[PDB]
Every structure is written in structure tokens, then in C-alpha cells.
Amino acid sequence: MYRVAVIPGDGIGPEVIDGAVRVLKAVTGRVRFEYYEGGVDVFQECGSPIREEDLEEIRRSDAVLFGATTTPFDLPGYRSLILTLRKELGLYANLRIIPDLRTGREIVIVRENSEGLYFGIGAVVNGRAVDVRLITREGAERIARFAVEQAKARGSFITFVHKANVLTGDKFFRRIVREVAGEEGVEVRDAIIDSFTIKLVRNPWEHGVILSENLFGDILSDLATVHAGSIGIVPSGNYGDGIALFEPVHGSAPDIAGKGIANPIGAILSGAMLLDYLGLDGSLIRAAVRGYVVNGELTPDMGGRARTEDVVRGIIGEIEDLLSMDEVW
């Protein structure tokens, strides 16, 4: 059996993760689920958003499934759970795939996930505050290589988005992405971060494998969800050299917490990416979702009257009708 750590978190996190796990429990029985708490409640007990001993289990699990976590702005001392996990598990590649769920079309973003303006060097002294945007050869190379493999796997190219006209680190980053992509025969198109926002809303689907620094990727990936109906359909994988974590891009949405209306598709499809990463069958979850979308009613954030549970039951439905036959058929 494969060993998967599950971190529902809070707000709507438990809701959409209930959905994604049930869907996973319906395409395979080769996965054992271990649940851990995390977020403010755990901070207030222990001074950390995750317990040291739990973190020790989690780093030895085969993969991680993560919901969402509320990070209150006005709580001093508190590190975001997800940033902690990203750093603790060496997760340097954030892959966000924004689907138009009528057509087959995708926006594919590779967000560097370990450095940039997230590297953690910051300070205030005497009315002068700084944050240090760090790009390292090793950081550049390995996210470049990750990106070329997503290009190749798709017979595509890389759009490297940057501000190398202003940022020394983006000049450096650019050399290295061109070097690795050349060494491997992949085309790299330049894009500048400000004008690329325009290209990204007007012309969504012509950009290949988009690659950028950590914070730029953060920004572009939220923006790209204008093209799916809602940020709530969009999944991600955070990959490192020995483990990966999967979470929906959406947040913990405590407004609609417990109202039973949250969109589980982001979590579900993030479950798909987790099966892929384990060498199991994510395609089934994807196909099950495309099929349910055709006629199925959606959640309010997408515009329908449907409850979370109707979407979940409906997709399991389509899955059951796929496992009813062999891989062939």
C-alpha cells in the first residue's frame, strides 16, 4: 500500500478534502490515509502550525494531500502551514494547471517554490525594511529542468516570464533557463511580467509551459483562474526530490465554511495529480470530472445551484462507470 498523509486544515479545507479522498477511495484501494491536524489550533497548543512528531511521519509518507489553512494576518509569531511544509519537505516545484472545462485546453504554470522573494531573508531596522529576492544556480537549474520535462511531455515550449530589464536575479535566472532548455532542445520564449498579464487574459492558451520566479508564479497563477470559471476548480502539485504535496489552489474560504457549497473540484483534481505522482491513474479522475461537467450542475462559485455533496456523488458516479470495465475499454 502507498502511504499518504492528509491535512484537511480548516475552513472549507475539511469539506473539499472529504470529497477528494472519497473520490480517491473510489478509483483505488492501494492507498492508506493518515490524518494530521495543522494550523492555528496547533500553533496555540505547541507554538508551531504542525507538531514535530507529525512532521516526522509526514516527511516519510509517500505523498501529502493538503486542503487549506486559514492564516490570520493579526496573529503574531505565526508561520503559514503551507510555507512551512513547502520548506520542510524540499518542495521546489509548484505546478498549477488551469483547465477550461469544456474544451480540453489548459494553462500550465511552473512556479518556482523554494526561493525568490519567498526565500525568507527580510528585516526592518531604523525605518528601512527589506526582503531579498534570491535566485541560486541550483534553484534555477532544477526548476528549469522540471519545466523542460513538462514541455517535452507535451511537445511544447517554455514561456519564461521575468523582469530582467530591472532585476539582476531575473537576468541570472534567464541565462540558466536558456542554457538548460537549449542543452535539451526546448524553445524558450521571453515574456515580461507586466505585459504578460495582458497576454494572459486576452490570449490565454498560446503560452506553453509558463515558468517564473516564486512570487511571479504566485501572481500569474491566481490571475490565470479568470479563464476557468473559478479558482475553486484549479489543482496543484508541490514537488520535491523525494516527496510531493497536493493542494487545491483556493484558500480556506471561512465565509462559506460549513455551508456545504464549496467547490471540491480543485481538491479532487489535486487528488488526480497525486495518483499520477504515485504511478496510479489520475486520468480516471480527470475523465470523470470532464464527463460530470457536461451536464452536471455546479457549485455557486461557478454559477449553479448544486451542493458540494452533489458534485462529489456525481463524480464518484462517473468513476464507478469507468472502473466497471477494464483499463482497456
Ligand X SMILES: CC(C)[C@H](C(=O)O)[C@@H](O)C(=O)O
R_g of the chain computed on alpha carbons: 20
CB atoms within 10 A of CB 235: 28
Largest CA distance in the chain: 69
H or E element in which residue 245 lies: strand 244-248
State which of positions 213-272 bind ligand X (CB under 6 A). 218
Q: Which residues are catalytic?
A: 118, 163, 194, 218, 222
**Contact flag: residue 202 with a copy of itself (CB under 8 A):** yes
Question: Does 10 show up as a binding residue in the annotation?
Answer: no
Q: Which of 173, 239, 277, 292 binds a copy of itself (CB under 8 A)?
A: 173
**Contact flag: residue 193 with a copy of itself (CB under 8 A):** yes
Confirm if 71 and 10 have CB atoms less than 8 A apart: no
**Contact flag: residue 221 with a copy of itself (CB under 8 A):** yes
Q: Tell me the closest approach of the beta carbon of residue 136 to a copy of itself, in angstroms.
A: 5
Q: How far apart are CA 263 and CA 20, in angstroms?
A: 11
Contacts with a copy of itself by CB under 8 A: the residue count is 49
**Contact flag: residue 83 with ligand X (CB under 6 A):** yes
By DSSP bridging, strand 244-248 and strand 235-239 are antiparallel
State which of positions 174-233 bind Mn ion (CB under 5 A). 194, 218
Question: Does 3 show up as a binding residue in the annotation?
Answer: no
Q: CB under 8 A: which stretch of 62-70, 121-129, 149-157, 291-299 binds a copy of itself?
A: 121-129
Whichever of 167 and 306 has its CB closer to ligand X, that residue is 167
Phi, psi of 19 (to 5 degrees): -55, -50
Q: How many CA atoms lie within 13 A of 114 on its CB side?
A: 19
CB atoms within 10 A of CB 261: 18
Q: Tell me the closest approach of the beta carbon of residue 83 to ligand X, in angstroms.
A: 5
Q: How far apart are CA 242 and CA 6, in angstroms?
A: 17
Confirm if 203 and 55 have CB atoms less than 8 A apart: no
Contacts with ligand X by CB under 6 A: the residue count is 8
Q: Tell me the closest approach of the beta carbon of residue 171 to a copy of itself, in angstroms.
A: 7
**Contact flag: residue 194 with ligand X (CB under 6 A):** yes
**Contact flag: residue 129 with a copy of itself (CB under 8 A):** yes
Question: Does 218 show up as a binding residue in the annotation?
Answer: yes
Q: CB under 8 A: which stretch of 147-155, 198-206, 255-263, 307-315 binds a copy of itself?
A: 198-206
**Contact flag: residue 73 with a copy of itself (CB under 8 A):** yes
Q: How far apart are CA 181 and CA 196, in angstroms?
A: 21
**Cα–Cα distance list, 10 to 38, 39, 76, 231, 234 (Å):** 8, 7, 19, 18, 19
Q: How far apart are CA 185 and CA 177, in angstroms?
A: 12
Q: How far apart are CA 230 and CA 119, in angstroms?
A: 29
CB atoms within 10 A of CB 299: 24
Q: How far apart are CA 205 and CA 107, in angstroms?
A: 6
Window 113-152: contact mask with ligand X (x via CB under 6 A): ----------------------------------------
Q: Which residues are annotated as a binding site for Mn(2+)?
A: 194, 218, 222
- Binding site residues, Mn ion, CB under 5 A: 194, 218
Q: Which residues are annotated as a binding site?
A: 80, 86, 96, 111, 118, 163, 194, 218, 222
Q: Which residues are annotated as a binding site for D-threo-isocitrate?
A: 80, 86, 96, 111, 118, 163
- Binding site residues, a copy of itself, CB under 8 A: 71, 73, 80, 83, 117-118, 122-124, 127-138, 163-173, 190, 193-195, 197-198, 201-202, 215, 218-219, 221-223, 225-226, 231
- Binding site residues, ligand X, CB under 6 A: 71, 80, 82-83, 165-166, 194, 218
